[PDB]
């Protein structure tokens, strides 16, 4: 698997489509998210692709290596920590991330896992609260989708 | 992954939750689907876990061995051919299937692919037209979901 897609939906107006593509040793994540409050929103891969209880059943961030919550460029970060997406005034967040830790195959494969867009910005583990080292204080999960294999 | 789950949703009333568990060397599929018309409905694993155009974007049946469509008991069948599920008079179908071809890891893995419940009965590759050898004449996709990793 070299391509993947996620359709984000929640109990509200947030909705979006993320495309993943394996390019070399990185995964290029693109797509757009809408219905967002302008600003930064925590954007993470949660461990389970279980949507039976909304985004709630997606579990914690995907952290196969048992590291602490960080931002994408940190070394001490969860595999799922893709930091933040930014909604403009109109509520539109354009996603364009290149990540070397997430994968479409193997052990860090995120296929079958959940992409979650959060209510608040990810504090990147630099919040000076324990909550920050676990989730980045991104709060509630607005929309989420299971990452599936794409053509 | 030893457990997977799929939440089926469509444009109509058909919905359900399907659980998959690797038990021994096989995969047990259980769950229930409601909102269906009484009678048989094709139930297949489609190739892509792409819900960008509803269930249409799931692609054809998952068929890594390039075979024609058949019933779950046939030698000549697609890996995604799980036959029919049967809805009682209240539109409830209880799913209980053990399948030797699907898997939750490796080449036959259905993680990240789409579970689809169809409008009509799957003719198990025996209807006698070309469409039977491709889809079993199961018709349109009532509900579908991306198969994700469960805890
Ligand atoms: Ca909150
Ligand atoms: Ca039909
Ligand atoms: Cu998160
Ligand atoms: Cu089908
Ligand atoms: Zn994290
Ligand atoms: Zn088939």
Nearest Cα to A36, choosing from A105, A108, A97, A89? A89
Identify whether the C-beta of residue B15 lies closer than 8 Å to the C-beta of residue B142. Answer: no
Helices (H), chain A: 130-134
Nearest Cα to B50, choosing from A35, A145, A51, A97? A145
| A130 Rama sector, left if φ>0, alpha if ψ -120 to 50, beta otherwise | alpha
Mutation pick from A1, A49, A51 vs chain B, by most beta carbons of B within 10 Å, is A49
Interatomic CA distance for residues B127 and B32, integer angstroms? 27
Identify whether the C-beta of residue A22 lies closer than 8 Å to the C-beta of residue A110. Answer: no
Identify whether the C-beta of residue A32 lies closer than 8 Å to the C-beta of residue A79. Answer: no
Would you tell me how many other CB atoms lie within 10 Å of the CB of residue A23?
A: 10
Active-site entry in B77, B113, B118, B123: B118
Q: Which of residues 8-67 of B touch A (CB under 8 A)?
A: 17, 47-52, 59
Identify whether the C-beta of residue A71 lies closer than 8 Å to the C-beta of residue A83. Answer: yes
Is A69 labelled a binding residue? yes
What is the DSSP code (8-state) at residue A131?
Answer: H
Identify whether the C-beta of residue A135 lies closer than 8 Å to the C-beta of residue A80. Answer: no
Would you tell me how many other CB atoms lie within 10 Å of the CB of residue B3?
A: 16
- Residue of chain A with shortest Cα separation from B145: A146
Show the CA angle centred on residue A41, arms to residues A146 and A100, nearest 5°.
60
CB contact under 8 A, A113 and B148: yes
Helix then strand then coil, % of chain B, to nearest 5:
5, 45, 50
Q: Which residues contact A128 (CB under 8 A, 6 or more apart)?
A: none
Report the Cα A4 to chain-centroid distance in Å. 14
Would you tell me how many other CB atoms lie within 10 Å of the CB of residue B12?
A: 11
Total domains in chain B come to 1
Nearest Cα to B142, choosing from B77, B81, B58? B58
* Cα B59 to Cα A11, A89, B38, B135, distances in angstroms: 27, 36, 26, 11
Q: What is the CA radius of gyration of chain B?
A: 14
Nearest Cα to A147, choosing from B50, B45, B54, B53? B50
Containing B132, the helix (H) or strand (E) segment is helix B132-135
Tokens of A150: 């794409």
CB contact under 8 A, A111 and B114: no
Interatomic CA distance for residues B103 and B80, integer angstroms? 10
- Can you give the CATH number for the domain in which A9 is found? 2.60.40.200
Would you tell me how many other CB atoms lie within 10 Å of the CB of residue A12?
A: 12
Q: How many residues does chain B have?
A: 151
Tokens of B48: 């892509």
Q: Tell me how far apart the 2 most distant CA atoms of chain A are, in Å.
A: 43
CB contact under 8 A, A49 and B7: no
Would you tell me how many other CB atoms lie within 10 Å of the CB of residue B90?
A: 9
- Residues of chain B found within 8 Å of residue A47, distances taken between Cβ atoms: 149, 151
Containing B118, the helix (H) or strand (E) segment is strand B114-118
Experimental approach: X-ray
CB contact under 8 A, B149 and A50: yes
Nearest Cα to B118, choosing from B37, B7, B51? B37
Write phi, then psi, for B138 (nearest 5 degrees).
-75, -15
What is the DSSP code (8-state) at residue B109?
Answer: B
Ligand 5 center from residue B94 Cα (angstroms): 38
Residue A53 belongs to domain spanning: 1-151
Identify whether the C-beta of residue A55 lies closer than 8 Å to the C-beta of residue A116. Answer: yes
Tokens of B125: 């590759």
Distance from CA of B17 to the nearest CA of A (A): 7
Distance from CA of A17 to the nearest CA of B (A): 7
- Would you name the residues of A annotated as active-site residues? 44, 46, 61, 69, 78, 81, 118, 141
Helix (H, G, I), strand (E, B) or coil at B81: strand
């Amino acid at each position: 698997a070299t391509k993947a897609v996620c359709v984000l939906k929640g109990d509200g107006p947030v909705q979006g489509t993320i495309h993943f593509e394996a390019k070399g040793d990185t995964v290029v994540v693109t797509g757009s998210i809408t219905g967002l409050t302008e600003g930064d929103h925590g954007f993470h891969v949660h461990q389970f692709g279980d949507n039976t209880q909304g985004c709630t059943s997606a579990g914690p961030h995907f952290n196969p290596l048992s590291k602490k919550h960080g931002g994408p460029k940190d070394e001490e970060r969860h595999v799922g920590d893709l930091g933040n997406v930014t909604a403009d005034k109109n509520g539109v967040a354009i996603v364009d991330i290149v990540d070397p830790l997430i994968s479409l195959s193997g052990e860090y494969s995120i296929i079958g896992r959940t992409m979650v867009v959060h209510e608040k910005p990810d504090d990147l583990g630099r919040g000076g609260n324990e909550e920050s080292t676990k989730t980045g204080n991104a709060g509630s999960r607005l929309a989420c989708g299971v990452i599936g294999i794409a053509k």
